[PDB]
Amino acid sequence: MVTAHTNHGDIVIKTFDDKAPETVKNFLDYCREGFYNNTIFHRVINGFMIQGGGFEPGMKQKATKEPIKNEANNGLKNTRGTLAMARTQAPHSATAQFFINVVDNDFLNFSGESLQGWGYCVFAEVVDGMDVVDKIKGVATGRSGMHQDVPKEDVIIESVTVSEHHHHHH
Q: How far is CA 76 from CA 4, 12, 16, 30, 50, in A?
A: 22, 19, 9, 22, 19
Which CATH superfamily hosts domain 2-159? Cyclophilin-like (2.40.100.10)
The approach used to solve this structure was X-ray
User: Do 149 and 43 contact (CB within 8 A), yes or no?
Assistant: yes
Count the Cβ atoms, other than its own, within 10 Å of residue 30.
21
The full set of domain ranges for the chain reads 2-159
Q: 35 Cβ partners below 8 Å, 6+ apart?
A: 53, 62, 96
User: Do 150 and 43 contact (CB within 8 A), yes or no?
Assistant: yes
CA distance 120 to 15: 16
CA distance 14 to 164: 11
CA distance 153 to 165: 35
Q: 74 Cβ partners below 8 Å, 6+ apart?
A: 16, 19, 20, 110, 121, 122
User: Do 111 and 70 contact (CB within 8 A), yes or no?
Assistant: no
User: Do 36 and 53 contact (CB within 8 A), yes or no?
Assistant: yes
Tell me the one-letter amino acid at 123: F
Q: Assign residue 83 a region: left if phi > 0, alpha if psi is -120 to 50, beta otherwise?
A: beta
Among 74, 69, 109, 65, smallest CA distance to 91 is for 69
Tell how strand 9-15 and strand 122-128 pair up: antiparallel
CA distance 59 to 126: 25
Q: 97-120 in b/e burial notation, b at 16+ Cβ within 10 A?
A: bbbbbbeebeebbbeeeeeeebbb
Q: Helix, strand, coil: what percent of the chain each, to 5?
A: 15, 35, 50
Q: 62 Cβ partners below 8 Å, 6+ apart?
A: 35, 39, 54, 55, 56, 96
Burial class (CB in 10 A: 0-12, 13-18, 19+), 8: middle
Among 124, 114, 113, 97, smallest CA distance to 21 is for 124
* Residues in the chain, overall count: 170
